[model samples]
Target chain A: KVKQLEDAVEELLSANYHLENAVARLKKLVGE
Target chain B: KVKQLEDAVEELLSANYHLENAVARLKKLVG
Candidate 1:
């Protein structure tokens, strides 16, 4: 169960990074 | 453990939504 939770956390962190980059790129384009 | 995972998932989803909205707002401003 601990391992499973770890995987879930990793998945969340990975996807969060993707969204983070999306926001950052968009912000740059908008010159924010 | 399951409860913790559930909370983590919810947190991730919440943060992702925030970022998603930010991207959408920026897109609107740039266009």
Candidate 2:
């Protein structure tokens, strides 16, 4: 069985934002 | 949360190695 938590979505969203910022900076420097 | 896979050990090790290399390269490029 799998359990769902209310904060899971928010946590994942925040993580995604940081990941996007990192990738964006890399892409801006490298031009991908 | 329980899952079993034969490749799990190899996967984590491979990812760690790649992450190390990536961080190293990033540091070099930024410096």
Candidate 3:
């Protein structure tokens, strides 16, 4: 269970990073 | 350790949700 959670957290971190990058790019495109 | 990881995952999920929302809102704004 611990290992599974670790993997999940890692994946989530990666996903969140991408989403955060998307948010930044979109904000820039919007001139924010 | 399991409990800690669970809490962390929960927090990350919430943070991810907010970031996703931000992305959507920004996309709408840019359009």
Candidate 4:
């Protein structure tokens, strides 16, 4: 259970990192 | 730009829900 929770946390963290990077690039592309 | 960002958001959101369901099932299994 704990290991599964850890995996879930890592998955969410990784997803958030991608989301942040994508948004940053989008902002740059939008010229804002 | 907006469309790409929206796609990214939706993709992440979908993954998040799957993650949540997996965790829930794991909890039940481990218990």
Candidate 5:
């Protein structure tokens, strides 16, 4: 719903940010 | 319930065992 967009955006953005961090860590581990 | 412990065990046992392999691969690549 449009009314929930702000909350959803906050949650999704936080999750996406964490996923970026995780991928970075994974890449480092992979020595790439 | 205590009687349902077997069901939980079964579910956990069914999980793929690839996590250990993944961890090993990550460790090797990091070297």
Candidate 6:
């Protein structure tokens, strides 16, 4: 159970990292 | 508004990154 939660969070975090970067890059292109 | 969302996700991502790393490291120690 602990391990599962850990993996879940890791996946969430990793995905978020890219998503966060994507949004930042898009904002620059989108302007303002 | 768009930028706001971007900022939000970026913050979330940063926070989650920390959370995730913590969890990962903890798991290694705990397990």
Model 5 regions more than 4 Å off: A1-3, B1-31
lDDT (Cα, 0-100) at B27 in candidate 2: 46
Residue pairs in candidate 5 whose N, alpha carbon or C atoms collide under 3 angstroms: none
DockQ preference between candidates 3 and 5, better one:
3
Model 4 chain A scores worst on lDDT over the 10 consecutive residues at A23-32
DockQ for model 6?
0.18
Name the fnat for model 6. Answer: 0.15
lDDT measured at residue A21 in model 5 versus the true structure, 0 to 100: 60
* Best of the two (3, 5) by lDDT: 3
Give DockQ: model 1. Answer: 0.06
- Measure candidate 4: CA RMSD: 4.6
Give one digit per residue, the lDDT tens place, for model 1 in B1-31: 5555455555656788875675555445545
CAPRI accuracy category, model 2 = incorrect
| Order of candidate numbers by DockQ, starting with the best | 4, 6, 3, 1, 2, 5
Q: Comparing 3 and 4 by DockQ, which wins?
A: 4
TM-score of 1: 0.49
Chain B TM-score (each prediction, in order): 0.82, 0.63, 0.91, 0.83, 0.47, 0.79
Clashes of each: 0, 0, 0, 0, 0, 0
* Backbone-clash count (model 2): 0
CAPRI band for model 1: incorrect
lDDT of 5 by residue, A1-32 (tens): 44355555555456556555654554454453
DockQ of each: 0.06, 0.03, 0.07, 0.18, 0.02, 0.18
Q: What TM value does chain A in model 3 reach? A: 0.87
- Between candidates 5 and 6, which one is better according to lDDT? 6
Per-residue lDDT of B15 in model 5: 35
| Best-first order by TM-score | 4, 3, 1, 6, 5, 2
Q: Which structure is stronger by TM-score: 1 or 5?
A: 1
Off by over 4 Å in 1: A1-32
Better of 2 and 3 by DockQ: 3
Note the residue pairs that clash in candidate 1: none
